[PDB]
Design a protein around this ligand. Structure first.
Ligand SMILES: *[C@@H]1O[C@H](CO)[C@@H](O[C@@H]2O[C@H](CO)[C@@H](O[C@@H]3O[C@H](CO[C@H]4O[C@H](CO)[C@@H](O)[C@H](O)[C@@H]4O)[C@@H](O)[C@H](O[C@H]4O[C@H](CO)[C@@H](O)[C@H](O)[C@@H]4O)[C@@H]3O)[C@H](O)[C@H]2NC(C)=O)[C@H](O)[C@H]1NC(C)=O
Ligand SMILES: *[C@@H]1O[C@H](CO)[C@@H](O[C@@H]2O[C@H](CO)[C@@H](O)[C@H](O)[C@H]2NC(C)=O)[C@H](O)[C@H]1NC(C)=O
Ligand SMILES: *[C@@H]1O[C@H](CO)[C@@H](O)[C@H](O)[C@H]1NC(C)=O
Ligand SMILES: *[C@@H]1O[C@H](CO)[C@@H](O)[C@H](O)[C@H]1NC(C)=O
Ligand SMILES: *[C@@H]1O[C@H](CO)[C@@H](O)[C@H](O)[C@H]1NC(C)=O
Ligand SMILES: *[C@@H]1O[C@H](CO)[C@@H](O)[C@H](O)[C@H]1NC(C)=O
Lengths: 92, 119, 148
């Protein structure tokens, strides 16, 4: 309700023209050989899908458009402190 | 063991630079030593013995000193003198936490001189 | 002491103390020895080495400050309860502990010095652990001063 300017800080694929293979060219920091936290310089997966082969339609399977890495729930907070180098996308 | 100590900084700004340590830093497994001590699982064990000090020790008790000295010089003077002795290092020892109440001196005189403080 | 003898080494190599985890908050309860721990930093200034500040101790180990090792120190004191033997059970009432300590500190003492009967045998010959107990190896992560 008070910002007069909007900024985005995200690691989602497809933002800032960042893909899953161009990282080496994108980030000078990881130009050196990775030999380092697992999150250092680290998606897009198929179209939205609904699969339901069971007779009962009350419960059915859903495949989301994007990945849901709930295991690494501390990515953003650790990424902000610049503990490790990695992708960064900012748009105003 | 992993390589020599390294500093890598290819960026123009030298304020922030990359550091590669000499040894590995497996912070993910932070419970290695405690679980290793209980001998839950077999593994490497390295023990080496080093000698630092020799000869016997002597220990004095301040409580017995209070009891014995208060008989012939009163109670106020002995308590005041022992408090002064106990606050030699510039910080009180009683106020210190129990788990970390350890400190040494440099050539003190014990027992200290008890003033003849009139009541 | 019989003669001055301070700590010769510059870094304590002890791994019985769990190290802080990745998270900022410590999952394990606080350990005192962390006060003498060298932190690893992923971002470093130009020409930063442990020899400049942290001495010869290898990073990831514990570094002992200069004031804790003096050639010129001669006496130690401690007003603590942690060295007491098995007969100082905490669950017992304070009155019982006070009475037992008062009774024990008369038989054992001569004048104001402790007889060798009470001190641990490691400290001096003839000990039987009548007043003080031994020092364990797990008793290093919360009481670094005593072991040092
Ligand atoms: C509500 O409003 C507040 C106030 O505006 C917003 O807070 C600001 O958010 C923006 C967005 O992150 C912050 O701007 C960022 O600043 C970073 C630091 O830049 C400094 O770096 C140099 C060198 O170290 C310093 O000398 C100098 O002082 C700079 O200030 C930038 O790194 C960020 O990105 C910049 O660099 C990248 C390249 O790495 C470029 O691609 C970017 O385009 C950009 O140039 C970014 O600009 C800002 O600091 C915050 N505070 C203020 C007071 O503005 C809230 O975010 C907003 N709430 C919302 C939007 O929800
Ligand atoms: C405290 O340490 C002393 C020695 O430092 C231990 O005394 C030894 O006890 C074992 C058996 O318990 C004997 O075999 C040794 O000969 C003893 N050492 C001597 C007499 O020098 C004592 O047991 C320890 N007590 C505790 C509770 O750990
Ligand atoms: C990628 O770059 C082109 C031109 O450089 C720009 O038009 C486009 O918007 C960029 N893509 C994203 C997702 O920002
Ligand atoms: C302990 O000694 C210090 C000397 O550094 C003094 O400043 C302080 O007041 C003393 N505390 C007492 C007497 O309670
Ligand atoms: C230790 O004692 C010696 C005795 O001569 C003295 O020269 C030195 O300054 C003392 N050091 C400290 C840190 O008090
Ligand atoms: C002290 O304790 C010993 C046994 O520990 C006991 O034989 C003796 O009677 C007690 N009292 C004195 C004065 O020695």
């Amino acid at each position: 309700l008070l910002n007069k300017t909007y900024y985005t800080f995200s690691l989602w694929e497809g933002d800032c023209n960042i893909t899953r293979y161009n990282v080496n060219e994108t980030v000078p920091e990881c130009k050196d050989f990775p030999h380092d936290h697992p999150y250092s310089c680290r998606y897009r997966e198929g179209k939205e899908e609904v699969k339901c082969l069971t007779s009962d339609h009350t419960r059915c399977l859903y495949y989301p458009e994007y990945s849901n890495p709930e295991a690494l729930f501390d990515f953003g907070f650790l990424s902000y402190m610049r503990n490790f180098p990695g992708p960064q996308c900012i748009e105003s | 063991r992993e390589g020599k100590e390294e500093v890598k900084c290819l960026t123009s700004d030298h304020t922030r630079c990359l550091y590669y340590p000499e040894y590995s830093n497996p912070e993910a497994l932070f419970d290695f030593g405690f679980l290793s001590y209980m001998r839950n699982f077999p593994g490497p064990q390295c023990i080496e013995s080093t000698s630092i000090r020799q000869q016997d020790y002597e220990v004095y008790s301040i409580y017995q000193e209070c009891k014995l000295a208060s008989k012939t010089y009163g109670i106020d003077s002995v308590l005041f003198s022992l408090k002064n002795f106990l606050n030699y290092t510039g910080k009180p020892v009683n106020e210190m936490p129990n788990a970390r109440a350890f400190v040494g001196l440099i050539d003190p005189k014990f027992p200290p001189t008890y003033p003849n403080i009139t009541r | 002491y019989k003669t001055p003898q301070p700590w010769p080494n510059e870094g304590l190599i002890a791994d019985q103390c769990p190290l802080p985890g990745l998270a900022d908050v410590s999952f394990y309860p606080y350990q005192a020895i962390w006060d003498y721990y060298a932190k690893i930093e992923n971002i470093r200034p130009a020409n930063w080495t442990s020899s400049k500040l942290y001495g010869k101790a290898r990073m990831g180990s514990y570094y002992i400050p200069k004031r804790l090792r003096n050639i010129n120190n001669t006496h130690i004191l401690f007003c603590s309860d942690v060295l007491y033997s098995k007969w100082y059970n905490l669950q017992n009432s304070i009155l019982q502990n006070e009475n037992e300590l008062t009774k024990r500190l008369s038989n054992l003492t001569i004048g104001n010095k402790l007889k060798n009967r009470a001190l641990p045998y490691e400290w001096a010959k003839g000990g039987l652990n009548r007043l003080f107990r031994n020092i364990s190896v797990l008793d290093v992560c919360s009481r670094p001063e005593m072991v040092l």
